[PDB]
Design a protein around this nucleic acid. Structure first.
Lengths: 76, 420, 99, 50, 94, 314, 129, 99
DNA sequence: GGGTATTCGCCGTGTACCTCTCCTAGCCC
DNA sequence: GGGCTAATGACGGCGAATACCC
RNA sequence: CGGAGAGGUA
């Protein structure tokens, strides 16, 4: 469990678009479309998204290429 | 469209006003404020303003089951989703043009400033008092001048084939239809090249500034005279009658009813080719009713007892206290919140607050219901309600799960700085 | 006193009155301002739009939560649409031009 | 108490010195009486607020 | 000496502030929101970063409301030989 | 006394002309003491006509309080009236422009003082109430910011004369001192942004794309002048001077009409917006609250920025 | 229709600053119509009354005259600006924008009445068939 | 008196009647009736014993009581004491003194 | 001359709640 | 009945409306 | 129940 946002601040210096992107990540593993990439500790999707972005696993480029991906499959 | 900024306000054109609405109200019928049945047709119509009650037929006498979300006409009703109910709004196509009182009573009288005479002339012609030469006789007469009845006659027998002079808003309509704003702007700016007088240049600059403002606004002046009157859905305006001898202000409704009455009477008179005096008087109190509809504060505000609030009008419904009602006071109380006295817990870590179990149980009932039906522990909302009210030990695990890290926002009653 | 649902008033749709389940808390303009000083933006949107006034939004959003997902979609703000129709009835067209 | 009320008029100065004087007759019931001064030492009478 | 102590429009955090303390200086010209030429907004570097953070401020964050609440917060705490005789300099200096 | 007096004693202002030891008039440029000490109120004249003195001798004596002047009240009302930029016990006029100075028609209404620049407009007199403590001579050379009437100076003239940063420092120092009196410490960037809000409006001196004098957004002035040097054809222009509106006045001076609709008289404001077709940027935050959409700050600003980035990129 | 229409074209009585109007705020418009009316006699008035049927068609023809004289007046005024520049003119940057130097500036009213007289001659020639 | 534009009873009564009762074309009989009502009605204009006692003490009268209505002597005495205060030798009543 | 310097009516109202009352009114059928 | 129906024992600001010295 | 008037608390 990690509720402090310092690592996410360092990874994303704006730390404010950080909120938006982590919120989107949480929004689409909370509802189907993607699945958690970090082991669940009975955590809410907010903090698992936060721990994802802390590890550098989720960044703006990665999330946008991933999302454009799920579209080109959903039209296909 | 998406949630954007940079919003554009402009005077509406009659064609796209008609595009907004779907059909016109035939006859006006309004609740009596001792009888609350919405009478149709009128201010309450489930074909133009959308379904007042959704998924059922409403005409004020009809409550049949049939049109529960399907488009079909049985007595004149149209039932759709609540989204269409919000966008369905009314319009009434006036036979005669009508002015908007706000641009008249304003200190910068927009019609007056645009037409460059004092507002007394415009109020005189609109109030059906003195005629105005609408680009009439010019050889001996004057192109744009007010006329009394005897002067208007004298001009008429002087000339009737080169002379026109009307009354009311149609006169201003004819006037504003005449000007080509671009010609005026070009002539003024090119005159400023030749003019060498300080005051004359100031006057030309002011007129060209106003004309360029209207040009850039993209609004034709003919538009700002109301040709077709758009009307709200009934539920979009304040209306809360009280039982007994005490009631609540609802002047907007009967102002709509009065305006529709006047317009229908004028339509009837014009259909029968009624004489000039009677139709002019009908247009007169039609304009008066429309202006009272637009505002009563332009018609003179007054204080009513038991409520430090003026009589309701569309303009006063624009703004109450402290402003737009639903975005500030009063009073924006919101759900999913609680309030309680505070104690100290010196064991909680800095990111934690100690919250009573009952407070949590009643703050997260929907989340608890979702979890309970998610685990299969409940099969319906009723089972979830029973399950939570029975205070069984199972709901404690459910609440621990929904509160595992779900944070909460604590605010002091006065918030005097950001940390509040 | 604490709530998530319960009493609903007229004219101004907000929890009020009664003691069987007392209404919500007056989220006064000072609280809006405190949210404003922070980068707090969305919580302002829920505390003003989706859990305060719009009855259809409150119902659908409670349904979404009961479905097991914390769900809200901005879409068309209902108070915005109401005020838009209200201005339009004044013979004033509101353009939705985007920057 | 009803009777004479000798007070200092400090709001009638209207951005000036020399605070004025006032004498108000307050009846147990009826109409109030007012004898006030001006910044020019002129004595004026107000029956009630008129 | 005319040696460059700080670079172009650098943020003056604690280290640079101490470096200016040791190299005692009467005045500094600083970027101000007043001097800021940004329109419909304010340059971050014209502002600084003094907040609940210790890093350079970024886009958003309506510092006007923060300023208003910061001026109104201590409002509650607001309560209602020498000059004109002889100037006596109290320290030894030029 | 300096205050208004009879019409036969307020047309000539008493003066003690000091000549050299040769009987000839002398003047010293660059000093607010040419030789003729024009005597203010309660100026006890010490030297008679023809009295010989040394260099360093008193000419006139004006009693003072040795401290105790009341130019500040302190407290939250002091904070408020600085924020409203109200005149502190009537403004103390400064040197309205550099150049030689002289008297006009003294006490016609109040006194008049001509300031005569050597390269500007010589008729440049201003009005002088007799309630001010006068410190002004004839033949002396002054410069903008030099005090002409002694007393509390209003922020308005400070902005008009000494420049924007000068009144910035003045307001910042005043409010910060007031808050220090209670010991509370506030970083001055907040005062700077509040002032940058205060003087967000300016009046054009030399007309440009707008009228000769009018209240205009100074940011609009910047964009318009930048456009002006962008093309060859100047319009006009344009020269402007910032002016400090009061906090309430600056609030009602917001370009976005949404602000005024909820908090001032509405129908006239709405009609002005409609006829002018005002495309308000909706830059305002509480305005985005009023419409019902996301605010342009914090996460909401970032969201709208992402939308704009996705505009013309889909 | 008449092959000869007596008119006030290019008189010496049409040369005057237009100071006659129909309302307060003396300025342009409701003077243009007076301008091109003064350059035409009443004969043209009954000729245009009989030529054009219905009051509003005659009115639209009146504003047709007015726009035509406005076009000619604009033409004359920027020809005046052009010839002032060619003869040597420096733009004066005044409180109301750009003007020409006073010794080279004419008058807007004079260009207006000249254009009105020219168009009046044109319309008389139009009457002549 | 220099400010006062009246020198006779009827004109003063006319002015007072018009300014108490705006418009209402004045009648000297009506003005007399209104003045009598305002300062000489025994049924709706009372000073009561407490008012009379405080009144006499404020005027520092040797009297202890008297009429519950106003008289010419009362008005002249109160004007005399107000003038004395204006002269800087009278007293100003404390607004909160429990006496 | 002209800026004070008065007079002449309207109107706004920290925060939250606990209780209470009081709410467009005139009127011809 | 009922269905229509067009001020004084607050306080301060503020524009309009006057009040006044040289 | 929409907004005003009143006591009490913080």
């Amino acid at each position: 469990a990690r509720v402090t946002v310092q690592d996410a601040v360092e990874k994303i210096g704006n730390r404010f678009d950080l909120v938006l992107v982590a919120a989107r990540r949480a929004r689409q593993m909370q509802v189907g479309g993607k699945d958690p990439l970090v082991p669940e500790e009975n955590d809410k999707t907010t903090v698992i998204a936060l721990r994802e972005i802390e590890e550098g696993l989720i960044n703006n480029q990665i999330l946008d290429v991933r999302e454009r991906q799920e579209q080109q499959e959903q039209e296909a | 469209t998406e949630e954007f900024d940079a919003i554009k306000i402009a005077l509406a054109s009659p064609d796209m006003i008609r595009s907004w609405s779907f059909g016109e109200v035939k006859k006006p019928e309004t609740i009596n404020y001792r009888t609350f049945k919405p009478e149709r047709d009128g201010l309450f119509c489930a074909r133009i303003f959308g379904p007042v009650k959704d998924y059922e037929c409403l005409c004020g006498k009809y409550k049949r089951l049939k049109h529960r979300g399907v488009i079909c006409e049985k007595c004149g009703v149209e039932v759709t989703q609540t989204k269409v109910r919000r966008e369905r709004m009314g319009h009434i196509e006036l036979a005669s043009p009508t002015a908007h009182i706000w641009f008249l009573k304003s200190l910068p009288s927009r019609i007056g400033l645009l037409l460059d005479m004092p507002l007394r002339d415009i109020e005189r012609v609109l109030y059906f008092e003195s005629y105005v030469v609408i680009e009439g006789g010019m050889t001996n007469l004057e192109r744009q001048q007010i006329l009394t009845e005897e002067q208007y006659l004298d001009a008429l027998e002087e000339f009737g084939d080169e002379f026109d002079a009307k009354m009311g808003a149609e006169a201003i309509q004819a006037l504003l239809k005449s000007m080509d704003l671009e010609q005026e702007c070009e002539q003024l700016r090119e005159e400023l090249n030749e003019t060498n007088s300080e005051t004359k240049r100031k006057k030309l600059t002011k007129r060209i500034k106003l004309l360029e403002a209207f040009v850039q606004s993209g609004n034709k002046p003919e538009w700002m005279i109301l040709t077709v009157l758009p009307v709200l859905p009934p539920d979009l305006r304040p209306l809360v009658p009280l039982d007994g001898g005490r009631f609540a202000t609802s002047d907007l409704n009967d102002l709509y009813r009065r305006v529709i009455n006047r317009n229908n009477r004028l339509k009837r008179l014009l259909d029968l080719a009624a004489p000039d005096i009677i139709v002019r008087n009908e247009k007169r109190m039609l304009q008066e009713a429309v202006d009272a509809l637009l505002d009563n504060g332009r018609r003179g505000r007054a204080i009513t007892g038991s409520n430090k609030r003026p009589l309701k009008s569309l303009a006063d419904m624009i703004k109450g206290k402290q402003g737009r009602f639903r975005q500030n006071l009063l009073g924006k109380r919101v759900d999913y919140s609680g309030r309680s006295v505070i104690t100290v817990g010196p064991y909680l870590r800095l990111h934690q607050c100690g919250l009573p179990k009952k407070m949590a149980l009643e703050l997260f009932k929907p989340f608890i219901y979702g979890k309970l039906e998610l685990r299969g522990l409940a099969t319906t909302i009723k089972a979830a309600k029973k399950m939570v009210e029975r205070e069984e030990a199972v709901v404690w695990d459910i609440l621990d799960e929904v509160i595992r890290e779900h944070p909460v926002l604590l605010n002091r009653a006065p918030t005097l700085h950001r940390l509040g | 006193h604490a709530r998530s649902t319960g009493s609903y008033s007229l004219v101004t749709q907000q929890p009020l009155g009664g003691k069987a389940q007392f209404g919500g808390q007056r989220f006064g303009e000072m609280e809006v301002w405190a949210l404003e000083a922070y980068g707090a933006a969305y919580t302002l949107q829920e505390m003003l739009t989706v859990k305060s006034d719009d009855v259809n939004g409150r119902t659908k959003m409670y349904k979404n939560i009961v479905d097991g997902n914390h769900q809200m979609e901005p879409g068309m703000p209902e108070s915005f649409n109401v005020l838009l129709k209200e201005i339009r009835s004044l013979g004033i067209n509101i353009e939705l031009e985007d920057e | 108490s009803p009777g004479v009320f000798f007070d200092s008029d400090k709001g009638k100065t209207h951005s000036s010195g020399k605070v004025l004087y006032n004498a108000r007759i307050i009846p147990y019931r009826g109409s109030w009486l007012d004898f006030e001064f001006d910044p020019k030492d002129n004595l004026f009478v107000r029956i009630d607020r008129r | 000496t005319a040696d460059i102590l700080v670079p172009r429009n650098t943020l003056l955090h604690e280290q640079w502030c101490d470096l200016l303390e040791e190299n005692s200086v009467d005045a500094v010209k600083v970027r101000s929101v007043v001097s800021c030429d940004t329109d419909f907004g304010v340059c971050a570097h014209c502002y600084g970063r003094d907040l609940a953070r210790g890093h350079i401020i970024n886009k958003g964050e309506a510092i006007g409301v923060i300023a208003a609440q910061s001026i109104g917060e201590p409002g509650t705490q607001l309560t209602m030989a020498a000059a004109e005789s002889s100037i006596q300099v109290k320290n030894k200096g030029s | 006394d300096s205050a208004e007096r009879t019409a036969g004693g307020k047309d000539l202002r008493p003066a003690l002309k000091i000549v050299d030891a040769q009987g000839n008039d002398v003047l010293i440029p660059g000093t607010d003491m040419p030789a003729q000490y024009f005597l203010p109120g309660k100026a006890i004249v010490q030297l008679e006509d023809g009295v010989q003195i040394s260099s360093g001798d008193t000419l006139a004596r004006i009693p003072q309080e040795s401290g105790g002047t009341k130019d500040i009240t302190g407290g939250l009302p002091r904070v408020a009236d600085l924020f409203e930029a109200r005149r502190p016990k009537e403004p103390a006029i400064l040197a309205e422009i550099s150049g030689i100075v002289s008297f006009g028609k003294e006490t016609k209404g109040k006194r008049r003082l001509v300031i005569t620049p050597v390269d500007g407009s010589d008729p440049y007199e201003e009005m002088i109430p007799k309630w001010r403590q006068l410190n002004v001579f004839e033949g002396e050379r002054v410069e903008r910011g030099d005090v002409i009437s002694d007393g509390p100076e209003a922020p308005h003239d400070i902005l008009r004369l000494r420049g924007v940063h000068a009144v910035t420092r003045y307001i910042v120092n005043e409010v910060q001192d007031v808050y220090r009196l209670q010991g509370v410490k506030i970083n001055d960037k907040h005062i700077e942004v509040i002032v940058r809000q205060m003087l967000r409006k300016a009046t054009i001196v030399n007309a440009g794309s707008s009228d000769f004098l009018e209240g205009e957004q100074v940011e609009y002035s910047r964009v318009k002048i930048a456009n002006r040097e962008l093309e060859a054809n100047g319009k006009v222009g344009a020269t402007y001077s910032r002016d400090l509106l009061g906090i309430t006045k600056a609030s009602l001076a917001t370009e976005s009409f949404i602000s005024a609709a909820s908090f001032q008289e509405t129908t006239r404001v709405l009609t002005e917006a409609a006829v002018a077709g005002k495309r308000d940027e909706l830059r305002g935050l509480k305005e985005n609250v009023i419409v019902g959409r996301l605010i342009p700050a914090g996460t909401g600003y970032a969201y709208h920025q992402d939308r704009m980035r996705r505009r013309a990129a889909g | 229709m008449t092959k000869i229409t007596v008119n006030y074209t290019v008189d010496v009585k049409d040369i005057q600053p237009k100071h006659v109007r129909s309302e307060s705020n003396p300025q342009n418009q409701n003077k243009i119509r007076r301008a091109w009316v003064l350059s035409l006699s009443d004969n043209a008035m009954e000729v245009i009354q009989n030529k054009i049927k219905s009051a509003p068609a005659r009115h639209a023809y009146y504003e047709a005259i007015d726009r035509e004289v406005s076009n000619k007046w604009i033409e004359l005024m920027r020809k005046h600006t052009t010839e002032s520049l060619n003869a040597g003119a420096k733009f004066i940057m005044t409180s109301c924008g750009e003007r020409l130097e006073d010794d080279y500036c004419g008058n807007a009213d004079e260009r207006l009445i000249v254009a009105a007289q020219i168009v009046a001659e044109t319309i008389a020639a139009d009457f002549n068939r | 008196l220099r400010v006062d534009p009246t020198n006779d009873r009827l004109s003063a009564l006319v002015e007072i009647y018009r300014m108490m009762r705006p418009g209402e074309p004045p009648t000297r009989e009506a003005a007399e009736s209104l003045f009598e009502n305002l300062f000489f009605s025994e049924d709706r204009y009372d000073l009561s014993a407490v008012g009379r006692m405080k009144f006499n003490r404020s005027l520092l009268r040797e009297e202890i009581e008297g009429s519950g209505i106003l008289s010419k002597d009362d008005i002249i005495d109160v004007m005399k004491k107000l003038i004395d205060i204006r002269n800087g030798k009278g007293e100003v009543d404390d607004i909160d003194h429990l006496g």
